[PDB]
Amino acid sequence: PQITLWKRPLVTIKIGGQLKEALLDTGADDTVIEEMSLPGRWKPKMIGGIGGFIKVRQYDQIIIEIAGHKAIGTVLVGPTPVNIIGRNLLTQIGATLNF
Amino acid sequence: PQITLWKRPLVTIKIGGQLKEALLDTGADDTVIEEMSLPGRWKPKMIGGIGGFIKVRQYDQIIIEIAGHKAIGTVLVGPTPVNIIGRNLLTQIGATLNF
Ligand SMILES: CC(C)c1nc(CN(C)C(=O)N[C@H](C(=O)N[C@@H](Cc2ccccc2)C[C@H](O)[C@H](Cc2ccccc2)NC(=O)OCc2cncs2)C(C)C)cs1
Ligand code: NA
Ligand code: NA
Fold it and tell me: Which residues sit opposite A49 in a β-bridge?
């Protein structure tokens, strides 16, 4: 598919047995998901955005479907106002930026 | 070009006649450049993301070249951690996401 950028590039994702909306974000190294009760072990992490750092929980080998494309990798869970799909997962679904 | 996402999608920009490196960022509504001297009039604004808000200088109708492509639009200047080209200018250069 092709997604234009006139509006936020939001797609449906499936994670943890739940459907959510998330932003395909070429400017994010990592994938940040809103607070959700994922099972199993995690590692504390802090990640930085434009206004400073927040605390998140790092979960590895998490299965996530992005716009119908299966992916598996690390997901950072914490208090974000928007779910962000970063390059660690965008590469797995073969996403490019084109102009 | 077609840009893949195994590395950050950094390109060279020209702004105010000066070369800089910036990130092509589909998860950003706006374009935010590090503190610099820039010709044009500006007004104070705040912009937010992960971590909260920062104070910036809003410059409208600024000429910028992004990887060799021309855009003319709003540039926010302030203490961003990285130079970000957001959707307001990615649309101008005809960028899309594809997978
Ligand atoms: C839900 C609602 C609040 C929203 N508002 C928006 C519109 N807004 C404010 C933004 O687009 N704001 C932008 C932004 O930070 N976007 C973000 C998504 C977001 C949006 C709103 C609230 C929280 C996160 C998404 C952006 O790709 C930023 C860009 C960035 C890159 C490196 C360093 C600093 C920043 N990426 C990150 O947040 O993580 C970046 C990581 C840091 N180092 C490597 S990757 C820019 C202005 C920079 C979208 S959703
Ligand atoms: Na959708
Ligand atoms: Na860095």
Answer: A52
